Design an enzyme around this catalytic site. Structure first.
Site, PDB file in Angstrom:
ATOM      1  N   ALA A  55      19.249 -16.388  12.039  1.00 52.68           N
ATOM      2  CA  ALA A  55      20.019 -17.160  11.668  1.00 52.68           C
ATOM      3  C   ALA A  55      21.138 -17.972  12.362  1.00 52.68           C
ATOM      4  O   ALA A  55      21.542 -18.983  12.128  1.00 52.68           O
ATOM      5  CB  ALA A  55      20.687 -16.674  10.444  1.00 52.68           C
ATOM      6  N   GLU A  65      20.913 -19.102  15.300  1.00 55.76           N
ATOM      7  CA  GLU A  65      20.473 -20.047  16.056  1.00 55.76           C
ATOM      8  C   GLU A  65      20.016 -21.438  15.515  1.00 55.76           C
ATOM      9  O   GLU A  65      19.508 -22.207  16.080  1.00 55.76           O
ATOM     10  CB  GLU A  65      18.932 -19.621  16.921  1.00 55.76           C
ATOM     11  N   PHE A  92      17.053 -15.211   5.986  1.00 53.46           N
ATOM     12  CA  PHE A  92      17.193 -14.159   5.172  1.00 53.46           C
ATOM     13  C   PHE A  92      17.926 -13.119   5.699  1.00 53.46           C
ATOM     14  O   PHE A  92      17.635 -12.425   6.527  1.00 53.46           O
ATOM     15  CB  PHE A  92      15.924 -13.513   4.612  1.00 53.46           C
ATOM     16  N   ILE A  96      20.489 -10.283   5.651  1.00 56.63           N
ATOM     17  CA  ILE A  96      20.576  -8.626   5.156  1.00 56.63           C
ATOM     18  C   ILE A  96      21.535  -7.870   5.403  1.00 56.63           C
ATOM     19  O   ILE A  96      21.702  -7.622   6.649  1.00 56.63           O
ATOM     20  CB  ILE A  96      18.858  -8.224   5.217  1.00 56.63           C
ATOM     21  N   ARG A 141      28.483  -5.087   9.474  1.00 58.48           N
ATOM     22  CA  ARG A 141      28.823  -5.883   8.654  1.00 58.48           C
ATOM     23  C   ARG A 141      27.924  -7.276   8.878  1.00 58.48           C
ATOM     24  O   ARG A 141      28.047  -7.553   9.919  1.00 58.48           O
ATOM     25  CB  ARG A 141      30.509  -6.299   8.681  1.00 58.48           C
ATOM     26  N   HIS A 198      12.432  -4.505  -4.269  1.00 53.74           N
ATOM     27  CA  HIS A 198      13.170  -5.604  -3.685  1.00 53.74           C
ATOM     28  C   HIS A 198      12.078  -6.425  -2.751  1.00 53.74           C
ATOM     29  O   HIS A 198      12.266  -7.727  -2.949  1.00 53.74           O
ATOM     30  CB  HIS A 198      14.160  -5.240  -2.717  1.00 53.74           C
TER      31      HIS A 198
END
Lengths: 232, 232, 232, 232, 232
Positions: free
Chosen positions: B130, B132, B154, B156, B162, B201
């Protein structure tokens, strides 16, 4: 193709009293008597561009009347990459909790040497703390010579002061730098949920950073390859 | 208009010793003996603009004296859209948790093809994670050819480090890029409240991303149509 | 005062070998043989200046030697307001949870019409979601014609993904846009503490947005009046 | 020293057909027949600078050949301060919860008047809400005439919507404005932990804002004095 | 090398009626009758550059025809450092909770005097509170003369208002300033988890800031040395 007496930025421009515009390029001083070249030379100097002095005589203090401007010179530009399949990576590491960033760096270098086998060179840059990473990254990005920049640190809540401000500032600053200079910057600055220095966390995070180094190496390789691909 | 020998950015400008300003446009070198054209050509080169070579002779090394500047050239411009009812969309997807971003991308492409039926073409770009995405989006927006950009990932919380810092940086960077380049950027980067990898999930988020892809496709179509509408 | 043959931005500038900076202004092509006017016309074109072609003959292809530059032309400027006591407001509304933003918009329009009584006109612009408001606001502000911009949305925590990232991005982007373009932007994007879709929240928020619309109308009128006051 | 016929920004530049460049400065139109002055006048107009027309005749429509450029004119500049020991302060206040911001403003003005005794003048500017403070501050900073700017508001969690987004946006925007315009901006926008309108909070915050006004007055005086000191 | 009559920024440019361009450099007024020098002098003045007037006569009101432009002058530049092994550091300290920032400053100065022994000089700048630090730091960075800037404050939750907004704004603004001016800025602004003024916290934080001062001193020395190293 005409001989290149000297190529580089104009170190200093001196308009002598004899209607000659003396300009120093690549450590060599050259002067021109052309009236039209003087405003062009002044604009070139003030625009931060690199000109190539061309003349039959390349000695110091020799007149010239030929010059080429490729694309607004080079100046601080010519960065954002070196070459495909042969480039360099700058690894900026903080010296706070060095025993874990060291593991990350060792894993990164070992994996890069295992895959590329000498095609990629990694240079290590030490830094006192995580707060000093964005400016160092900006300097190394504007200097060119690097296709990607990796910054590693271990931001820790010590139980006395709050640590989230510095982590947020560092992450946002790295993103801003990579958007400004158009050089990829990969983040290996990590903030654990809990770390109370009970030697169990100390044993765990050694191996976890060992894994993160390899992950970052793979990500850097693939992002550099993709960016070089879409630029054609 | 006069015969367009070559149109494009000045690859390099070379002022020869015979009072001729040789400029290479669209891979062809052209030179001018006009004294007034030299400062104009230098300004055009330093402003990052594209000039159109107009002359009776279009061969290499042929002099010309006719040139047309539409609006500060093209350069890096001419973007922010391709054409109404026929444009392109860039789908930047992260390779972290690929099994779900894949569902989102498949739903997006299927719905696009269902409504437009070949009017809109989607190009697919891979990215390590994410972090990049904003730089890739900025590059693809500045290159033109795209009326919208979609970025899917996504993010997670893995239970060790954190994750909110990277998510905040990515969202803010995408918005900054979208405001900078004036190309719409739609966000399909999603951060669930809880994800513990218990296959419940995993089964739920497949279908939920399947829905999100269709939603993003509809939003992209509507926003492109509206932006094209208000610009007339 | 000299007749204005055509006023507007230069659509295209064509320096023909004839040494004439042919320039198309307001859909009409005009050419000049003045040597000094050519660099001025080029500078006006590259600076986004709007020139007024002045000549005894206003037909197409007629020579001219008179031109006026008020203040760096108009270009994308001439915005940040239309006129006192008679201006326009742009109301950008998201289509997510439309049944409540509709109430807000109706309240806003009704209050405006009640107080001003036709002096202020409101134009409605539709947008897929809250994330697409700042760019639309920037476009509508740069286009001029508007003394204020209002953006309405209902950002809701759906219980699956986190929603604060998008809300923070939207608020910060609207503030950045209004600081950039110097056009007031009033925020009616609201994030409730709890909303579980139990028809009690649905009944409550209808009336609450009905109130918020009137509040925003009063705030917009007051801020426009004050800004017009302090500029004299 | 040469007489100043008119000093100010060029209201409009008109190049008449008689090779004269008519420029309106400080409400008076002046024209020059100098060929070299025309590009200089155009550059002065496009750079947003103020020129001083100088001639033996100061009447309208009189020729001139003398002009002085101090430092890129004044334009929007000449701000960031008025004078030492005699300056002005702009007090921007929100009208939401006026009964407390009123106490803060009264304390501020009373303390200023007690210490300076008429050396510092405070001007009051009214604003509908805290979200509209940064743009007003930017306008009042760019206009000059002010050595410091104070913004006061009372951001309150009403129990229905979340309030931290607007407070964060306001603080960050005020900081950005003060960094952009180089005019100090003191923050008296305060967000209490709890405020449930039980008349105990209402009685407490009156006196607390009364104290905060005096604190802000002292801070503003000291910061203005220090900034004036380090500039010598 | 030619004599330097005066070197500095052009205080004011005056084009007299006798075709002479009078320019005041370093407090001395010089005029030139060269037609080509007038546009060059105007460009130098508008670009914020420092020129060196050169002539056989260095008296006031003496004609000149020789001038040197090193690299777009100096202007506000020539900063980002003073000299290796002999530089200066600016210590900006807030006056809120002075009894602890005093300990930090004393530790910093004592450590720098212990290691360098007079090579590095520290200048102390007072500031009302943490919010006033970034602008002061920007001013001191742009003025030059400093290789690093240190900002110290103690941001405290008083139990009435929320304090995280100001701390976040200060940290982000300090990072933005250090990225803007390319001068390192070290952060000694600290926000404790709990501080209830029970004199146990008061006794603890004295010694803790005593330690933090030495830590910041070491970090500043290391970062200045490294930045000077990588620039060669």
């Amino acid at each position: 193709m005409h001989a290149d007496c000297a190529k580089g930025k104009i170190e200093f421009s001196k308009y002598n009293e004899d209607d000659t515009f003396t300009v120093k390029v690549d450590g060599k001083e050259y002067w021109t008597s052309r009236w039209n070249l003087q405003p062009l030379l002044q604009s070139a100097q003030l625009t931060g561009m690199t000109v190539t002095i061309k003349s039959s005589t390349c000695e110091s203090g020799s007149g010239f009347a030929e010059v080429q401007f490729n694309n607004d010179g080079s100046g601080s530009g010519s960065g954002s990459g070196s070459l495909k399949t042969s480039f360099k990576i700058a690894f900026i590491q903080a010296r706070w909790h060095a025993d874990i960033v060291d593991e990350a760096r060792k894993s990164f270098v070992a994996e890069l040497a295992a895959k590329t086998g000498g095609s990629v060179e990694v240079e290590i840059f030490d830094v006192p703390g995580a707060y000093e990473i964005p400016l160092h990254a900006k300097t190394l990005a504007r200097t060119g010579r690097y296709a990607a920049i990796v910054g590693a640190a271990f931001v820790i809540d010590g139980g006395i002061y709050r640590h989230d401000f510095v982590a947020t500032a560092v992450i946002n600053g790295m993103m801003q730098v990579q958007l400004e200079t158009e050089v990829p910057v990969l983040s290996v600055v990590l903030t654990p949920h809990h770390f109370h220095e009970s030697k169990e966390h100390h044993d765990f995070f050694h191996a976890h950073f060992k894994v993160k180094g390899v992950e970052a190496a793979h990500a850097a390789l693939q992002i550099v390859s993709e960016r070089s691909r879409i630029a054609a």
